[PDB]
């Protein structure tokens, strides 16, 4: 009570980030930003816990102060800055870019993309209203309020962003067929098609999904991201390609490399 | 605070420091046997004033200080050493004697435990009362 929690206790931190139980007592509490605390992945995690470019926390606040680092082009010195789905990160050195993408097991994955074509970002539209003085705007999933949108784009769709300004370049409608990414649920992080909408007014819109190997599943609508035409992913995609496999299937692929 | 006591006296040889494998030797103990002896720690050492007790980290030989955390091992007096075989210290021949006695018990019977504890506590208060 009495105010906003500035702290995060380890084991209160999401399993996404995979931190050691024992280590220290606290987790890094994501700042306020574009995505959400639970769905974010702060800078300090990325630099030190997967890349292992940093060892201390003191290192990242010593490397971000270099302005070595940028997400969506902007520099972002805040050590505990909340970086989530679909953003990109160029780095001054290493001539090397990443986009933040889930693997099949639902955690954020390291994934590299070209110097160009990190120039663009994707985003799901969740709000379409009329602004003050009649100026229509959309809201993406990263807090971007983008004005003058192509009319009859409409909610649940996705939009390419040019990252020079908040420019909307193209848009994919949300319709039966389009390729999707799962962003929630037990099936978080899978890809493939779209085969139904149980409309369920007043309630949750469950949405039936079929993947490359023809596995049915359902996730509620706010757990799906429309990601372009089938077989033609509108974004560079990490080598796992989000398809799921049996727990017994995974064992065999290890014993292949005897 | 109620009933704890500073062990008070004088450093003659060596130094006392807060936390110490002091050997507390009562006036029964002899360096051969195990007797009125305790090997326990010296919580703190402070120098005495008139209700000031400014605390202190250690103290050399030839001075006047108090020790805390020692009292519970002391009946009335004693020598503290860190030698494996240092002897006791002379028994302070004084002049008066516990000769004028009286009888006590508690007005209320429930209080006797607080009385028997109290009589041990009073006997530490003074160097003479039996």
């Amino acid at each position: 009570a009495r105010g906003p929690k500035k702290h995060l206790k380890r084991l209160a931190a999401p399993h996404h980030w995979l931190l050691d139980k024992l280590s220290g007592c606290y987790a890094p509490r994501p700042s306020a930003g574009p995505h959400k605390l639970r769905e974010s992945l702060p800078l300090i995690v990325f630099l030190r816990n997967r890349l292992k470019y940093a060892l201390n926390g003191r290192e990242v606040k010593a490397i971000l102060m270099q302005r070595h680092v940028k997400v969506d082009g902007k520099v972002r010195t805040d050590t505990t800055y909340p970086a989530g789905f679909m953003d990109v990160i160029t780095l001054d050195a290493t001539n090397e870019n990443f986009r933040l993408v889930y693997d099949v097991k639902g955690r954020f994955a390291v994934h590299r993309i070209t110097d160009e074509e990190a120039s663009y970002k994707l985003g799901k539209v969740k709000k379409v209203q009329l602004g003050k003085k009649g100026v229509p705007y959309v809201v993406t999933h990263d807090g971007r309020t983008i004005r003058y949108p192509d009319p009859n784009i409409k909610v649940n769709d996705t939009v390419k962003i040019d990252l020079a300004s908040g420019k909307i370049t193209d848009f994919i409608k949300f319709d039966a067929g389009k390729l999707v990414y799962v962003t929630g649920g037990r099936n978080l992080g899978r890809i493939g098609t779209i085969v139904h909408k149980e409309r369920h007014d007043g309630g949750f819109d469950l949405v039936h999904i079929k993947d490359s190997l023809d596995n049915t599943f359902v996730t509620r609508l706010n757990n799906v991201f429309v990601i372009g035409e089938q077989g033609k992913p509108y974004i560079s995609l990490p080598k796992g390609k989000g398809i799921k496999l049996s727990i017994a299937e995974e064992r065999d692929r290890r014993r292949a490399q005897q | 605070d109620k009933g704890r006591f500073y062990a008070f006296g004088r450093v003659f040889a060596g130094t006392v420091k807060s936390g110490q494998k002091v050997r507390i030797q009562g006036p029964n103990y002899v360096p051969g046997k195990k007797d009125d002896l305790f090997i326990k720690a010296i919580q703190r050492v402070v120098l005495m004033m008139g209700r000031f007790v400014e605390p202190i980290d250690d103290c050399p030989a030839g001075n006047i200080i108090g020790l805390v955390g020692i009292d519970q091992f002391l009946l009335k007096t004693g020598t503290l050493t860190t030698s494996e075989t240092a002897h006791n210290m002379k028994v302070m021949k004084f002049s008066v004697s516990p000769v004028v006695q009286v009888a006590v018990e508690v007005k209320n019977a429930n209080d006797l435990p607080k009385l028997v504890e109290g009589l041990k506590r009073l006997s530490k208060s003074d160097p003479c009362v039996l």
């Binding site: 024992l22 220290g24 017994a248 | -």
Partner: protein, 131 residues
């Protein structure tokens, strides 16, 4: 406060304390393998019971239960990987058969005696112990 360390008991004490049958059958296993405590025996029979516990619990699932096949292999994969399950007996529920002796055989202490090398299992133990 930081997270709790987890810990577990490795052993389990018998129920009837003075059945000579168990008292003697235990002592035979001691001199044979050069053990000191019954804890050394108890630890192993507790392991073996913690193992049949899983084993009977998988045969109740009908063949082709993905969990049955998956940890059924995982078990035996770990049990002839040590030699306490013989290579032929890799079949499913030969596991329920093992006594403790197959484990004391695969102990380091016994091999250093059954590979020449020690002349006595009591000599083996101290040979291991002293670096």
């Amino acid at each position: 406060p930081r997270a709790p360390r987890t810990y577990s008991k490795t052993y389990s004490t018998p129920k009837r304390p003075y059945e000579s049958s168990r008292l003697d059958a235990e002592l035979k296993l001691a001199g044979e393998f050069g053990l000191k405590n019954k804890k050394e025996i108890y630890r192993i029979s507790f392991q073996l019971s913690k193992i049949r516990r899983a084993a009977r619990d998988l045969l109740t699932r009908d063949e082709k239960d993905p969990k049955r096949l998956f940890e059924g292999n995982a078990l035996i994969r770990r049990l002839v990987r040590v030699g306490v399950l013989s290579e032929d007996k890799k079949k499913l529920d030969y596991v329920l058969a093992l006594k403790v002796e197959d484990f004391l055989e695969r102990r380091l202490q016994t091999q250093v005696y059954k590979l020449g090398l020690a002349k006595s299992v009591h000599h083996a133990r101290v040979l291991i112990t002293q670096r």
